[PDB]
Design a binder for this molecule. Sequence first.
Ligand SMILES: *[C@@H]1O[C@H](CO)[C@@H](O)[C@H](O)[C@H]1O[C@H]1C[C@](C)(N)[C@H](O)[C@H](C)O1
Length: 7
Amino acid sequence: XXNXXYX
Ligand SMILES: *[C@@H]1O[C@H](CO)[C@@H](O)[C@H](O)[C@H]1O[C@H]1C[C@](C)(N)[C@H](O)[C@H](C)O1
C-alpha cells in the first residue's frame, strides 16, 4: 500500500 483511496 502507501497510496490512498477510497474505492
Ligand atoms: C487515511 O490517511 C489519512 C492521511 O494520512 C489519515 O488522516 C486517515 O486517518 C487515514 O484513514 C484511516 C481510516 C480508514 C479510511 N478507515 C482506513 O482504515 C485508512 C487505512 O486509515
